[model samples]
Target: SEAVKKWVNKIIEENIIAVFAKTECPYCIKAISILKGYNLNSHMHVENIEKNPDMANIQAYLKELTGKSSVPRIFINKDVVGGCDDLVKENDEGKLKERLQKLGLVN
Candidate 1:
């Protein structure tokens, strides 16, 4: 658990974008699809805990960080950006694109 937390913290600190998700989650699918269009291959990291031995502990750490125990937890510029619903809402309102542009993640 502590190890997962440390690993998560390290990824968050080192990556410009990070998504904690499960491969089979529909919400994760949507989040990945949106991110794929941004051409941020090097800047982003996605952790799918589906087969992880410490899945529950990893999720517990995430819940402690974001207050939600769901997959597709997104972070941009080391800031929490909520989950799939939030992503969809922001995308629909053009805010997600705007944020990405501001961060130089998209043109």
Candidate 2:
């Protein structure tokens, strides 16, 4: 259990973009898809909070950081980017490009 917690922290620390959600979450799938469309390879860091007992504390930590217990929470360069709806709206309005550029993911 401690190992799993360590692994989770490692992932968060290393990733500039991390998606915290399950495999079956629609928002998770959609967010990744939209990010790919924008030419950003969004890595899905899936952890089912319902099933992964080792991740319960980590999930709570994330919620404390974001102030919302929503799945598919995205972190762009260590900043919370909300969920699929936020990504979709931003992408549709070309805001996604600006953010990618700011993050050095685009030119």
Candidate 3:
């Protein structure tokens, strides 16, 4: 009980960025690298739910948040930011930095 709460808070708080993806997904790695390029590392958490049996709850949570089961679902400050392509497009349009900064991830 306490452990689960701690884990959930660890995933929810402190982490302004959250990436839900599989371990072997290249796109996931690319997405993480892109976020790192923006100097937001500790805020992000990469959870490989594919092999984790505890993913049933995670699947339900993701479905509720994004309305789809998409890997690399990025969330800023516990808010959904969509997938890798969406993040890339946002960066291309110069919106990613603004959003991250709004969430206090950047200067």
Candidate 4:
């Protein structure tokens, strides 16, 4: 808990965008695809937790932090922006691109 907690908070604080995801998951695919369309590049931090030896540990801590039962937890500016459906909602509402531009992600 403590170790992964430290990693989690550090990652959240360090990136403009942070995504906790599994490569084989559909939700993660959709969410990451949407963000990739924005061309975030280096600003986007995508973590495939399945690749980690501590996948369960990190994911368990994620549930505690984000309160979500799934993967592809997307964060913008250190805040939880939610998962795939939430990301779709943000895009549909036009707020996703707005936040991107404001944060200079579209560059």
lDDT of each: 0.85, 0.71, 0.78, 0.86
Clash pairs (backbone) in predicted model 3: none
User: For residues 1-107, could you state the per-residue lDDT of candidate 3 as single tens digits?
Assistant: 34544554567566778787887898888899999998887667777878777666666667766887768778888777788999899999989989988877788
Rank candidates, lDDT, best first. 4, 1, 3, 2
TM per prediction: 0.90, 0.76, 0.81, 0.88
lDDT of 1 by residue, 1-107 (tens): 56889988987888888998886788898887888777877798998887788888888888898899889889888888889898888888998898899988788
Count of clashing residue pairs in every prediction = 0, 0, 0, 0
lDDT of 4 by residue, 1-107 (tens): 68888998888889999999886899898888888888876788888888899888888787887887479888999878888999999999998988888887775
Query: Where is model 1 poorest over a 10-residue stretch in terms of lDDT?
Result: 33-42
Which 10 successive residues of model 2 have the least lDDT summed?
41-50
Q: Candidate 4, overall lDDT?
A: 0.86
The candidate, 3 or 4, that scores higher on TM-score is 4
lDDT for model 3, on a 0 to 1 scale? 0.78
* TM-score of candidate 3 relative to the true fold: 0.81
Query: What would the TM-score be for candidate 4 when compared with the true structure?
Result: 0.88
